[PDB]
Design a protein around this ligand. Structure first.
Ligand SMILES: [Zn+2]
Ligand SMILES: [Zn+2]
Ligand SMILES: [Zn+2]
Ligand SMILES: [Zn+2]
Lengths: 184, 184, 184, 184, 184, 184, 184, 184
DNA sequence: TTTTTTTTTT
DNA sequence: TTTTTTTTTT
């Protein structure tokens, strides 16, 4: 960890936007970096993060990524532009913590695509999610478009084409509508 | 270790006999024993073995079966009918590590059925994979008939039809001829 | 430098206004001048500029045009009508490096038409790209009409129809709105 | 150099198997590495090599790759399995030189796919090509299958699907037949 | 006649608002009544009507509803809230046959929602379909909202989600404008 | 009747080769004629036949078609070449009766494709089916190929592409194998 | 004649919307009828008409169809709804003559799709084309959509998919724009 | 009649050896003669024959060649090497009409190569097509090699490569076996 | 995939 | 793409 590829099921079992469908007690994060040292080349970085369960360093993926990014990368005076493809979305208290990283780290920009939502009625979630988009970080909901790109590059697809499910395009509409309301 | 079966999704993945199958950082060993103490009912011994990548004993799944069958089982003066179903062909130091085993334990007869072959161009694999079928064992490629077997006895198929995958017979044949070239 | 035109294949590539357009490690600047010494025929000045990544002068294509137009051309007391067609939006230190130029050389009027925008989230780009159209210049996104122009005057099209590409108008619009957001 | 992606035309202008069609005075090589340190992880390496023209270090791609592989990589006691997708095939005297690298470097295995052939009547070519397959290195001719995989991974495709030409499947047949005769 | 509901498969078929929809040799009429005798509980009356093509009474589904509502129901001095859901727009001799009905039975208020329009170019349809909404009725095209209604109250949906079909809203809109052109 | 098109479900509910899957108490026949009057043009004829249930003229489709073909068509001295796409195959005693029509009617040739089989152990069926192929009439089993052509031309498809099911390609294999044995 | 299918080339040589591209001295018409006898079934009729060159009965397809429709069909009191897919459009004096047929024949409605235009500057053409749409007959320009349906049903396609050309989608735009101006 | 060659588009159409090839209401006969008067230079005679469907002589292309070769050519006491290339297999009354010809004109040797077979189930075709190759002629199916020949000698290919079509060899083989079954 | 394309249709 | 599928057809 961080591993660079989800096994075909790990993707389906944890990336299906099935709201009231109980079956996800963890969260996965897929990303793509973008290093830009003012007057120097531009390199890429991609991978996958899972929630930890060992003695220490719990982190719900979102956090686990911030750790990896701080003491490992985070180059002085250089810019960054990361993209996320989270599954069990920034948790009620995570979304807020992430929005405060982009705070004391202006050299980094972020774009977040998510499959589900830790409920759209929870206060903490409305807080951290609204405050996240206030710090300049576009938060959208994975549609058929995003699930394809996410399956083709972060899954040991064995060269198999993405196969959509019943409800995808719907739950997108419903998840997007209920987000565009909280993200007003 | 020794667990009794593999979940459905786990099987179809680590057992797909592909050439480009990238993502299998572990080999799986399945088996059916057949104990004949001569003066009792013919008993058996099923099971499955995931490999190892932890602190103690970094056994390549094949190495862990010998340790389990050496002291827990193996009754002096009793013929054994062992049948494997390895996903990842026997590794270099393992192909010989088993040939030396089969050598001393004459009462043990073996016949292996692999799904994929580990770098068939290499010598060290051909050395072991050769002297191995030269002992009394028999190395063979899993065809449709064999895979079917596993989906019935070594997986929690939940009473479900096999359903192969494009290029099973094709990959099978090519793998067989590439083996029969070496195995001589 | 200053070459007169781009080969067909070279144009369609470095000029495709895409969002994910990865592979453009150089910016291209096209232009049409219009010299009016007031008491003579209205002359012009065409051309194209590839950037630099060699030993001497690491000018970002935009920096090399100022050096070429500073001493070789530019006749004191003569209005200039400059029109660019940059593939890669003006870089941070260049957006301002040109605003300070346009400042002193009042007789020089400019209007830029970019194909793609260089990290619009960043501040340093918005600083320059703002004070630039605040000088007397005008930054704008290349639409279908503009691209067409180039394929006629800055490329060895060999007498051939334009033929856009999927997502030209779409990418165009989104890029325009993202610019009009900053440009204020 | 070695760069990691060919611009769309560089691919078409140099990878089209148009025998008597004069228009290729250079050669390109696309590859994929495969590091295997006995009991350690397995990393990948991909890129592109072009013929040099600078003062020294000429090399026709084939050679340029051997240089890069020697003093840079080539890890002691570790194995390697490279694959090539050459354009202007191993030159009359290169094919032979490559076959002699695989000689004093048994830890490395090779597979070569090519678009055209430096003529199939040239002695030196029959020598080096026959001697190349003698050192254990399968040399085949790119078909529609190979050109697709080669275009989708080594070309700034801008996410565009491979588009085949008139003669591809034919010249394959003719190039493969005239190779299976020399590679008897 | 009057049956209470349509099987799932039957609905999606005879109700697909298509332009080329060929194969509907029968019209279906669905309805919800709302009886208000003023001095009693507000009751209702559901139902569905298949047309006719048998020996006696060749009523076009619409003609059969009037016969059923004329003597079996219709209590003098009681307001009626009728709502139809015809698949096939009211036929020529039917559009007027209903306008003359609505005329005399003033206590009857109606509002129709059709799925498809029967040859809108013809006059005889426009004559009826005009004087019909000029009586107190109201002819309208079934949009997504209305179709949904039916899949809930007039079909044995077996507790299942609606799931429209490509070109529902598209065909809907075009049909609406083609109606609003006539209906004037 | 004979109608010229099956409603989408009538096709699925009656053309699915689900052996022990009880749910087909009737039979449907889809066909294509071919008139050839020695030295005259060549016209076509297509349609669909369902089993009758009225007072008289029962016939299980197979028969209903022979009736229609006798007193209606069957032109003297002219040839015919019909093709069938039957669902609930020639019944134990029908297959035989059909084989005896081709007897006293040599001017007619036949080709039969079927979805299921009225069991392959029934004597009468082995009789009539073996005797049917003896009279020159190729009897095969609908595969994915046949179901597509059969769905695209004999079903009010509303311009929708054929959508295959779970078991199709399998039951074909099993039905074809068990037929090639009886049709020895 | 009227034949019911164009040979693959006859379609390409005469249905390509290549304005100034000289190579069409004749005209072809593809159609689909629609009989509707008030309270009777609804039958279809399709075919192809070519310009005559024999001694008499010249007619430029458009006319040849009116002849066939008059003394042959044209049933009293019954309605009709025809559709055209003309190639060398209603000639300057034909378009007008067609518009006057729809005059003394109100029971017939028409929809015309065309590939090219007998020039959009010719008076007679502006007359007959404007007067044609005045008599209630929608005249549009074949796009990719129309050419597909037209190729799949009126051409001996040998089961081959429609293959579009260079300029189709463009000339449509240009032909549609220059028509929406005259059809104001 | 006798014309020297077929236009490109005409060939590929009437010569496509398909099973469902519907649309060929005419047969084409190609041929190469080889006159040997024994005491002169070996001359030849090329040509092509379209069938007939006009007032006088309704010859089926094959019947018209006999009339042309009976009086215009055919010099008593001179061996003839005739080779046909019929698109449509010899018709019933023609297969025998030629067998009776070959019978009397012994000095005439023939060998036919057909593209498609006319209703091979029929008897009258087998009668002729049998006694025909029993005379000294030889009926055979056009494979890839033969078709190629025609595209070189009987068509205005305008110096262009053959380019077969999907299912040429496949249809070829099946047609050959179906012929070899009869031809016995 | 629960309702509609983004410039010149290999 | 110059002639033919490799196990259970979202
Ligand atoms: Zn720089
Ligand atoms: Zn190890
Ligand atoms: Zn005739
Ligand atoms: Zn009626």
């Amino acid at each position: 960890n961080p591993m660079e590829a989800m096994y075909p099921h790990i993707f389906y079992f944890h990336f299906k936007n099935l709201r009231k469908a109980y079956g996800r007690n963890e969260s996965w994060l897929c990303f793509t970096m973008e290093v830009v040292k003012h007057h120097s080349p531009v390199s890429w970085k991609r991978g996958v993060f899972r929630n930890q369960v060992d003695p220490e360093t719990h982190c719900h993926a979102e956090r686990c990524f911030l750790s990896w990014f701080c003491d490992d990368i985070l180059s002085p005076n250089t810019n960054y532009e990361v993209t996320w493809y989270t599954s069990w979305s920034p948790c009620p208290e995570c979304a807020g913590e992430v929005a405060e990283f982009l705070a004391r780290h202006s050299n980094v920009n972020l774009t977040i695509f998510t499959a589900r939502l830790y409920y759209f009625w929870d206060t903490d979630y409305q807080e951290g999610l609204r405050s996240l988009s206030q710090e300049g970080a576009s938060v959208e909901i994975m549609g058929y478009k995003d699930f394809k790109y996410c399956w083709e590059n972060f899954v040991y697809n064995d060269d198999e084409p993405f196969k959509p499910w019943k409800g995808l395009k719907y739950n997108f509409l419903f998840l997007d509508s209920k987000l565009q309301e909280i993200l007003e």
